[PDB]
Design a binder for this molecule. Structure first.
Ligand SMILES: [Ca+2]
Ligand SMILES: [Cl-]
Ligand SMILES: [Cl-]
Ligand SMILES: [Cl-]
Ligand SMILES: [Cl-]
Ligand SMILES: [Cl-]
Lengths: 139, 142, 154
């Protein structure tokens, strides 16, 4: 009938360059049209900032540049409490704005909600994005 | 039990699907495999207008991709441009570009957690593209 | 025109009741039904995109009637992430689709993220169980659990 979501703040490592690069462009923009670059991403997601943070999930999917980045990815949890579960995520922009939680699996079967993105830290080779998960699942 | 929300009905939107020509608004970045007959991937930034006439205002973009798997499977963000609806999106997924239906699989902003369908009907067939009438039927929980 | 109308929704309004389906995942051979169209980046270990038109049957015998196709793509980002339309063939179910998205082709689970026609607003999951491994592909058993909500109020 309704159960909300019990997360703290997550921090996604969006790293396009450097020796820890976790995404790759597989097509280029059409120069005439101004779109078409497709990037495939395996973004690590941590439970905090700093060397003591634990990796709790990966964001595995793709984003395509259609004048802005459209995303589709599986948020696959690795921490023991949620291992076996995913949230399915889709929407616009990587580093700010919102994404939609369009479904899920495991403990998140039938999840619906949103993920709010805020810039947390800009590093040399990438950035860290604060994720705030709001949503619910039916019981 | 029940989830309080708002049913959302949006009529008379017109999507400009323009594969070619000076107003081309999508690009194929892969080709169909010769032997299997599938594989073309097209990235699209389709404009969506509030009317068919000369005075129609652009009110959204459909930003995403579609892939040819014997028919075209679509995944995109319908991003609204009205300073009113600014930022808010509907997340759209499904088969066929010019006819049939798409699923509304989620949303953001004023359309957070949207669920529903988009109905497509071709309105005008032109030399380099077509105009597709869209009808949105959706529900957003509060 | 944008019409915003107060309404109620019951999620368990209409359960999606199917029998078991059987998906044919065939990467090679004379019945190959998918193609890889981008390459993995060797430096990063990800990037390959495959476009698929998987056939789906209602049984494992020769008299199994094809009832659907799974039309979409999967992308390798350390694991295969899937996005496809499940397009049904039979009359009454003609035109109707389930929208499916999630990780892994042959095991685990997928989300039902939406639908059209009779499956408008579908929500749920598809469980995958390996059913048979053949020379050019495998057959995957599909178990559908989900609901279509009914709207009320207004
Ligand atoms: Ca959904
Ligand atoms: Cl990026
Ligand atoms: Cl963007
Ligand atoms: Cl082609
Ligand atoms: Cl089509
Ligand atoms: Cl996999």
């Amino acid at each position: 009938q309704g159960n909300q979501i019990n997360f703290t703040k997550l921090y996604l490592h969006h790293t396009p360059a450097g020796p820890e690069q976790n995404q790759s462009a597989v097509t280029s923009n059409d120069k005439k049209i101004g779109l078409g670059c497709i990037v495939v991403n395996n973004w690590s997601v941590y439970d905090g900032i700093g060397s003591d943070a634990k990796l709790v999930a990966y964001a595995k999917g793709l984003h395509v540049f259609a004048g802005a980045w459209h995303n589709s990815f599986s948020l696959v949890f690795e921490d023991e409490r949620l291992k076996g579960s995913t949230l399915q995520v889709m929407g616009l922009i990587v580093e700010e704005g919102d994404w939609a939680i369009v479904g899920g699996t495991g403990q998140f079967a039938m999840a619906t909600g949103v993920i709010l993105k805020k810039m947390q830290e800009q590093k040399q080779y990438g950035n860290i994005i604060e994720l705030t998960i709001h949503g619910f699942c039916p019981l």
